[PDB]
Assembly symmetry: D2
Homo-oligomer: 250 residues x 4
């Protein structure tokens, strides 16, 4: 319904937030290609949402530049012209700036920053001037707004994603590309990422962190992405959309 | 559909943005009471959207404090317990801070600030702890983010609404009131308000103002309000939602 | 030294932050008039900093509009043309939006908002186009950035001051008035205001509030005001300056 | 005077903003080591400010990780324990996100992001827990707040610097390291960087960009850095300091 005729690429769409985004996208009429590095997890994820007439899994590392062009070619051949790109693939490292190894630093930014750049850049090139009502949704974080003492590299990547997206949004708007670029800034969401962050759920459920006294679910982010992907938000570009249970409000 | 069982008060719902919010709210299954100071315009506005089974007009000035209590009583009698409050009623004065008369200053703030406060305060008192999935949507502006040399009082009011709403959102969250509070920050939208601002449409359509090269329509704001009113945004509180064609992105 | 030839009005300069601003202003060569409602405290405050050749007390309520004109006339007669206005006079009420009486609401805003407006508006009219390197410094807060569940009216006032100042700054800049307008956003500072907020010092000293593990002192705000008052910041206008021990960084 | 006993490393201190920072730092009593890639420009710069008793040039690429440790060792041997680190070295590329080569992307981020990370990380390790009143000043930009259609990679780096610094500031504060971390966000400043951006000065001097109708000078940024380096700002950490002639205010 709300995403009629839309064709979406959702990176890291096999687990957590990305899975829910893909799930709700298909539910609203969109055709979706999800990516991930693990094929077994990926195929199970895709089949869990629907058949290959609406959703397909493509194994792809978001930091793999050459693979991005093939990903677009695959999606377009399968479903027609890509209209929506969700740069969701991302990882977290639990290290202060002081304690961050250069290897940790480079690896996180390769995925969280370079991966988003690859998708956004190619997304603009491929979707511009085609009357698709194209939408690029880049997954930032509340960590793109505020800092965390043990998420140094993570903070850097999300701050980068936040502002880089504004540049793309402006360029597309000024050149009448019919492409919108926005960022989503989830608070803490119950996902495998958060499960891997030791004690994060109990600590961030505290009122001093999340005022609602609990963390969110992947569907909380799926629904704001549906809005941004749909023509409902045709006047929304370059903006930041925060779903965080009040985290950044205090 | 998306607003099933919701009962909404939309202040200033007889023209422009408020009218579209009411229009789309009814479309998504909500019961709506719209307010305005002019009865002739108001009654015509309500009938243009639907019958009295889904929408009714109530004559009410948002700055009328005593009237707010009667408004809630009237809405509740007609449709049952209020679940949604859209503090949308607002006015603009085209004056620099330097050139603003104290009368202009007090009158704009009476409506834009005191009115939003009256609605938010009573909204919390009336909707808390009732499992309604209550949502309070306060209409700020891009003028709550950036200044304009000829919108002094307006800027003050929208900045106040922006941050006051965060206070309410936090209070409701920490006390488990089941009430969410968010602000919407429209860019320039084609409405009687903008029509009353001499030459505003052509000037704000310039790329140096709105990068998309045009201003928005009332439906652009209606749809984000639908999202905030719905249980889809159950994890969104204390946040700011900007639909401005890229105005604040540059 | 750093404020040579400057003539400053500092509202609420008899205690706390305002007192320190006046103290350091005089130290850096400026002539200062401090205001307050209590004459006994005020006269003692002025004499504690210096003689009437550098600082004088004038009894004046910031919400007294007519009194503002006489204040400027008095200051100018004593020290020559005013070059600097610090709208610092402000009060706090410890109430949620829900629990705020309309009387509390109107009174806080009368001082914190209308007072700042009166000073800013007249400040522009009186200091523009005189080559004074004029600076208007409006005292907002971290509560102009984030909300607090028990500072509803306060949050509104500080958000208003934050954005209204931008309007004034832009107007002055575009019209080449040689007047700059900026806002200062202190975190929690050890003052009679904070002392009047029951238990505020111990609670806001907690790491979850102020990361430095303590609140600030009035001199912390004095020194950033000295910078904004001086010609050192001749390229700074419409901006927000935060001294909060990291409060808003998390 | 204001920087008594301070020992500063200023990366890219041989031209533009960095040169002025070094100049004013020495003027205020600090000992300074400036870096740059070109030795001839570097030595001329250092000698132009003072003798080797107050300032020395060290040839160093900010993206050279191993060189950073030697830089700290050199500075400390020459002047005693480092107290201040100004991560100022940075470059700009005039390309939209769409038109940005991966090489351009990687090279800019290597300097503007990785360089700042190297300096901040080592800065914390070397200056913590020594009672130095240590200050880390990371040079972001207005391009870390808003986007520009032809500064894609640049926007990314400055957004990254903006938020990464907050993480460091929090960690240092919570662990009582006696190290502060803040970001400076200059508007357009007359420097060789801006001269290399074709037509940037005339375009950004337009009122629609910089409201003051002109761009700034390197000293405008030097003076805010002096404040941040001095003990005057001992309560300021994790914050953003904007000197932009009103650019981001509209
Ligand atoms: N969960 C939160 O609290 C939260 C909060 C704010 C922002 N975010 C952001 O939302 C995004 C998703 O978060 P999440 O919690 O859902 O993470 P997640 O649960 O761990 O799932 C991440 C997904 O991305 C895939 N992936 C991981 N690395 C990849 C790579 N290099 N290339 C392609 N795909 C990759 C993963 O599959 P494979 O491992 O098999 O590759 C997985 O399907 C992230 O960008 C995150 O930064 C999350
Ligand atoms: N249009 C924009 O570009 C724009 C941009 C950002 C934010 N906003 C905000 O969005 C809100 C609505 O904007 P708008 O453009 O649609 O305004 P509008 O076209 O002029 O319509 C305002 C509506 O509010 C009613 N109203 C006016 N004063 C009232 C009062 N004291 N009490 C109750 N109702 C009142 C009006 O009806 P009556 O006159 O009969 O009372 C009218 O129905 C405003 O708060 C505005 O500040 C608008
Ligand atoms: N202290 C903090 O933690 C903090 C944090 C952020 C922002 N601020 C802001 O910084 C400003 C000063 O704070 P503060 O802590 O130093 O307050 P304070 O300790 O209570 O002192 C307030 C000063 O203003 C005067 N004053 C009060 N009401 C006035 C009025 N109507 N007209 C003129 N003068 C008046 C008071 O003298 P009289 O009573 O005799 O009139 C007093 O000298 C305030 O605007 C506050 O909102 C403070
Ligand atoms: N100018 C503006 O309008 C403006 C506005 C906002 C932010 N900023 C930021 O302020 C900082 C300085 O700006 P600027 O205008 O003064 O630039 P600039 O005039 O071109 O000077 C940059 C200085 O850094 C040195 N440098 C360049 N690349 C380096 C590297 N890889 N390693 C070490 N040193 C290096 C340069 O010397 P060598 O070439 O010999 O190496 C030069 O001395 C930058 O981070 C910039 O992003 C500038
Ligand atoms: Mg990199
Ligand atoms: Mg916070
Ligand atoms: Mg009033
Ligand atoms: Mg702007």
């Amino acid at each position: 319904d709300r995403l009629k005729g839309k064709v979406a690429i959702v990176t890291g769409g096999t687990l957590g937030i990305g899975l829910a985004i893909a799930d709700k996208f298909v539910e609203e009429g969109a055709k979706v290609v999800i990516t991930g590095r693990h094929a077994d997890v990926g195929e199970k994820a895709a089949k869990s949402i629907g058949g290959t007439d609406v959703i397909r899994f493509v194994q792809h590392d978001a930091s793999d530049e050459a693979g991005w062009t093939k990903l677009f070619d695959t999606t377009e051949e399968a479903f027609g012209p890509v209209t929506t790109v969700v740069n969701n693939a991302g990882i977290a490292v639990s290290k202060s700036v002081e304690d961050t190894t250069t290897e940790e630093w480079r690896k996180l930014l390769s995925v969280n920053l370079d991966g988003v750049f690859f998708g956004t850049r190619l997304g603009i090139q491929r979707m511009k001037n085609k009357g698709l009502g194209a939408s690029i949704i880049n997954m930032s974080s509340i960590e793109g707004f505020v800092g965390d003492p043990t998420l140094g590299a993570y903070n850097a990547s999300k701050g980068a994603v936040r502002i880089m997206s504004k540049s793309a949004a402006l360029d597309c708007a000024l050149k009448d590309y019919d492409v919108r670029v926005n960022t989503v800034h989830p608070g803490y969401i119950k996902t495998p990422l958060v499960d891997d962050l030791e004690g994060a759920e109990e600590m961030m459920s505290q009122r001093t962190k999340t005022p609602m006294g609990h963390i969110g679910e992947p569907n909380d982010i799926a629904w704001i992405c549906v809005y941004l992907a749909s023509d409902e938000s045709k006047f929304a570009t370059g903006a930041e959309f925060v779903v965080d249970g009040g985290y950044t409000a205090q």
